[PDB]
Design a protein around this ligand. Structure first.
Ligand SMILES: Nc1ncnc2c1ncn2[C@@H]1O[C@H](COP(=O)(O)OP(=O)(O)NP(=O)(O)O)[C@@H](O)[C@H]1O
Ligand SMILES: Nc1ncnc2c1ncn2[C@@H]1O[C@H](COP(=O)(O)OP(=O)(O)NP(=O)(O)O)[C@@H](O)[C@H]1O
Ligand SMILES: [Mg+2]
Ligand SMILES: [Mg+2]
Lengths: 351, 36, 352, 36
DNA sequence: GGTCGGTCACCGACC
DNA sequence: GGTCGGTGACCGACC
């Protein structure tokens, strides 16, 4: 998923905003209540029709808007293709409209879905992830930076799998293969040959949907690739002190501190932020092509001056990537470290 | 890519299976009537 | 609860620490992983037997320690009386030894409780509050600053009211009433009216205290008004009359007004939630003086910009006046130097 | 003072006429409780 | 002061 | 409706 343009009107803290996104790093600066997080939830609401902060859709409408209407237009690219989502959340009429059109090479707009429910299903297909996976990996909201890290092994594996697999394919494959076994049981030399087919599909079903086999192996093989980069990021950031590995039995992410073992929840504020950020920029690297954005809303304030600058240094060395990387901060000490800035105050972009 | 699900799965079987020819055959037929 | 002294060996990230607490404000300041919050969970652990970060006691033992044993001595004053708690967690032997003693004026230690559970039970009787109430009101942990404010209605009232009433007293009181009533009905001219009349007076009094609908409700409401009165005051000073606060349990909890526009706590920004949370905390701290005489706020000024960090710090300084043990924990030097008395921790030991 | 029992004395006096008798019974009970 | 056991009181059940 | 049964909380004693 690669953000290209985002237009906001009267969404939460926002009054009007219009942003082109591009490869590289961008810092979104601004005071409290300026509208930084609103812009983040905006993208979230453009795609999945869910936000972070509120249970109910009509809450997201800027209550000061005089027509009670929030409008969102989001344009993004995936896998060569290019998509446009338009939304109106009308809080007076209590009407929520939403369409997703494809943008073709000849400049017309082929429609793929209208209304919230089918737009979300379409978005979830094009992306190949669900909302939870989105906010737990490469799109980390304010105050929720360490959720993946301290999650139980069950959740972690679901999240990882989903990033690197089509649930749309697997859902059907599992179903199709059910159908071809209850159609062989249905039957009742032929009865030996249909007994021995039921049993070759069943060996296939087992290696593929037992919890419990290849899922456990595949998660291992992904986290192996992911933690290889994290270990290296952690060697740079902590001078060889911290090591990270993943164990299902030991409750999840397991950290070594000068060799000593500690559950990720043992860590402190800064160490957690520091070890969530290098784990997050690792995941994004290993998920390029699948996931092409990396957003953080305010990790870096847990961090002391030494660690903030160190973290900033490594992050800055992502600038090279063909990734839409965006960090959000009120902290000027962190922000000044980067070149491309976007300042937001009072619900508008400034200067 | 390396971390391709079924390319990972094409291999997890070869370690754990001898009858992995007809099995990966079956898997391929099935994915095709999912492609359809 | 007024922390007098605290000594620690090998708990979490601490090696050795011996700390006498004073009145007014101290700032604990030091880098990521210094041991700041470790001291914080040490107090909570010594009193209630529970950390913040681990469900299992043996995990609080510093793994570097050569004996595999953590030791905790906490001494504190409540209601004139003085107590001391000594706890030894041995991670190697899976042993947790705890004991509570009143330190009489003469100075002999009279034992009160000598097990992790008997200590936790006596502590709740003394302090007046359960562990959850402690960590939501006046002892606020890193990353949990706003937990009371976005909390659902039924919890918010269980918590603030627990401060001001006694589960111990009420439980006994209700039972004794239950027996006196049973005896009177068991004991069944003028005497009958006397025996049967006091039966009813008891029952009319029973109805007023223990039908949750009755005084219990009313009490919680009087309590809330008191706390919100103060919270509204602080908010006027901090946000130029922009943000008001109120409580409605049919509206899902604490509700903020933004120039008159209603908004549930969870809808505020990271900065606005921390600024309003602290206000609420300071208020509860004022309203429960004599019952809780400490006020610890670890990691609660991170998502606060420069204008609000300066505003928040100045207000917090205006508590230096009060006879209390007030402690702020930070890694930010900027924020910590707005105050006078600093306690510096590095490498799990006090420095300077 | 915000004391649970002080507030009850005020709450009962408002809506209860037999309150003076009732608060009295309460005091006796509070005493038997404190003793134990 | 901790533990473990005894008894009495109370609600349940079947009489 | 009253009587029989079992289980649950308080208390004193002994470690
Ligand atoms: N069981 C343990 N044994 C030894 N060290 C531990 C243990 N648990 C945590 N630590 C480490 O002890 C150090 C102190 O932790 P902590 O007290 O949370 O730090 P802190 O001063 O509050 N730092 P911060 O919250 O980042 O600003 C950290 O480096 C932890 O990783
Ligand atoms: N429904 C709403 N209508 C109007 N304003 C709202 C609504 N919900 C929240 N706000 C306000 O919109 C402003 C922007 O919020 P937000 O975007 O989260 O700020 P922010 O930039 O992240 N500030 P901070 O977290 O403190 O760094 C805040 O003042 C919110 O209280
Ligand atoms: Mg924000
Ligand atoms: Mg800390």
């Amino acid at each position: 998923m690669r953000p290209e343009r985002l237009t906001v009107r009267n969404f939460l803290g926002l009054k009007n905003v219009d942003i082109e996104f591009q490869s590289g790093i961008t810092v979104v600066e601004g005071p409290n209540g300026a509208g930084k997080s609103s812009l983040f939830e905006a993208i979230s609401f453009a795609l999945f029709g869910n936000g972070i902060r509120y249970p109910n859709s009509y809450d997201y409408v800027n209550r000061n808007a005089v027509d009670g209407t929030a409008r969102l237009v989001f344009q993004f690219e995936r896998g060569g293709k290019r998509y446009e989502i338009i939304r109106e959340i009308n809080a007076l009429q209590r009407k929520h409209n939403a369409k997703l059109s494809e943008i073709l090479e000849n400049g017309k707009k082929a429609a793929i879905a209208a209304k919230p429910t089918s737009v979300k299903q379409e978005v979830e297909k094009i992306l190949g992830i669900e909302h939870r996976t989105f906010i737990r990996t490469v799109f980390l909201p304010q105050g929720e930076i360490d959720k993946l890290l301290i999650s139980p092994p069950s959740e972690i594996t679901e999240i990882i799998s989903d990033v690197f697999q089509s649930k749309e394919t697997l859902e059907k494959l599992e179903k199709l293969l059910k159908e071809k076994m209850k159609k062989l049981e249905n039957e009742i030399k032929k009865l030996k040959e249909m007994s021995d087919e039921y049993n070759n599909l069943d060996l296939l079903r087992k290696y593929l949907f037992d919890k419990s086999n290849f899922s456990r192996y595949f998660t291992g093989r992904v986290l192996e690739a992911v933690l290889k980069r994290t270990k290296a990021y952690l060697d740079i950031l902590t001078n060889g002190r911290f090591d990270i590995d993943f164990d299902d039995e030991k409750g999840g992410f397991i950290i070594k501190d000068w060799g000593i073992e500690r559950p990720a929840r043992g860590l402190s504020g800064g160490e957690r932020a520091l070890i969530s950020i290098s784990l997050a920029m690792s995941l994004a690297e290993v998920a390029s092509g699948r996931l092409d954005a990396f957003f953080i809303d305010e990790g870096f304030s847990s961090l002391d001056t030494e660690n903030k600058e160190k973290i900033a240094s490594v992050l800055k060395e992502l600038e090279r990537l063909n990734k839409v990387i965006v960090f959000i901060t009120h902290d000027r000490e962190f922000s000044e470290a980067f070149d491309r800035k976007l300042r937001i105050t009072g619900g508008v972009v400034v200067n | 890519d390396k971390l391709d699900y079924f390319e990972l799965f094409k291999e997890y079987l070869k370690k754990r299976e001898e009858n992995h020819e007809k099995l990966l055959k079956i898997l391929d037929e099935l994915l095709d009537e999912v492609k359809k």
